[PDB]
């Protein structure tokens, strides 16, 4: 799994010694977070389940 | 085979852990990229 | 600059270390952590 965004994190102080972080900017390749699953591995799983059900 | 389905995943920052309404924890965003690998062990199904 | 289309660039006011002085900064957020009432 991944969040493929090169991201810049900046810091500020909101009050009497209270730091805070925020997403400043991203460097420029706007993507979407995702996860890969091996396909043939997953079908091999579900055949075991219906075998018992 | 030699294939990989891929899921759309979203990002949130304001969570409510264990549905305890009133408590709101903020997620500090972190720098660099994100990679984490995990096994699959347990599943929940509902008849 | 132009294109089609999960981020919001947000005008934002805030306090400072001192009690009276304000702070006009900007940041980014996602979709599901902010709500319309622009």
């Amino acid at each position: 799994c991944t969040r493929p965004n090169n991201n810049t994190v900046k810091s500020i102080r909101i009050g009497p010694g209270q730091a805070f972080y925020y997403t400043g900017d991203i460097i420029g390749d706007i993507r979407q977070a995702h996860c890969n699953v091996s396909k043939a591995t997953w079908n091999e799983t579900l055949g075991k389940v219906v075998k018992q059900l | 085979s030699n294939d990989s389905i891929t899921l759309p995943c979203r990002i949130k920052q304001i969570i409510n852990m264990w549905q305890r309404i009133g408590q709101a924890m903020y997620a500090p965003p972190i720098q660099g990229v994100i990679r984490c690998v995990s096994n699959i062990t347990g599943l929940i199904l509902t008849r | 600059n132009i294109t089609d289309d999960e981020l919001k660039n947000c005008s934002f006011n805030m306090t400072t270390e001192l009690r009276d002085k304000k702070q006009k900064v900007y940041s980014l957020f996602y979709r599901l952590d902010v709500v319309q009432i622009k």
Epitope: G28, Q32, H34 | - | -
Partner: antibody
């Protein structure tokens, strides 16, 4: 990158159309888009259709009932099947490469069209008798 | 569809601007081409990644409403051709062209 069209030159009315466009010197031929666009004399351009190597095709919906675009990938040459030729379709026809670059998962639509960089020879499509 | 001026007249040396208008240009991206008469079209403005202004070399383009202005800096007498804006629909189903715009150079 080279490309060359292929045409008969003179086509009778009410017959069909067989065109193709051969591509060479392409290090990644497999990840572009391939399209036909025609042009009438003294007129604007006229998009026809497109093909990608998965097999997915779209078309101009007004012209869709008479056209078909197919593909060989061993020889990087994609074809063109227009039926029912009329004299109003006399013009200058083009094959073109529409490039796509990738910023992530192809199956999630994390790509964008670069733009149509490479344009064909042009062919004097003459529908006459 | 799209909307263009039919012809634009300018002397050499000045800055000619062509406004491609149209209903799909609320959202989608605009192409540009050049075609000499008797020869092939030429892509003249392509794009990089989305937050990168596409590409800025010799030409540029701005956006305001449904109008897209085609800025030509440093007009000389050799760029005489016919010009075309291109986009697709917001539904992303089919691809249309501009009407066509002649460059008139004094």
């Amino acid at each position: 990158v080279q490309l060359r069209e292929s045409g008969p030159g003179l086509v009778k009315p009410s017959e069909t159309l067989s065109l193709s466009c051969t591509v060479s010197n392409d290090s990644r031929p497999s990840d572009h888009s391939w399209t036909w666009v025609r042009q009438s004399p003294g007129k604007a351009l006229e998009w026809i259709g497109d093909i990608h190597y998965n097999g997915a095709t779209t078309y101009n919906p007004s012209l869709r009932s008479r056209v078909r675009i197919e593909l060989d990938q061993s020889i990087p040459r994609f074809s063109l099947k227009m039926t029912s030729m009329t004299a109003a379709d006399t013009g200058m026809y083009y094959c073109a490469r529409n490039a796509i670059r990738i910023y992530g998962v192809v199956a999630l639509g994390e790509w964008f069209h670069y733009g149509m960089d490479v344009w064909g020879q042009g062919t004097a499509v003459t529908v006459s008798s | 569809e799209l909307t263009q001026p039919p012809s634009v007249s300018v002397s050499p040396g000045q800055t000619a601007r062509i406004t491609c208008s149209g209903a799909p240009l609320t959202s989608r991206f605009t192409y540009w081409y050049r075609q000499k008469p008797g020869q092939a079209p030429v892509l003249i403005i392509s794009r990089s990644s989305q937050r990168s202004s596409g590409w800025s070399g010799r030409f540029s383009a701005s956006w305001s409403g449904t109008t897209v202005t085609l800025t030509i800096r440093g007009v000389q007498a050799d760029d005489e051709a016919d010009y075309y804006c291109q986009s697709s629909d917001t539904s992303d189903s089919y691809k249309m062209f501009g009407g066509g715009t002649k460059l008139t150079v004094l």
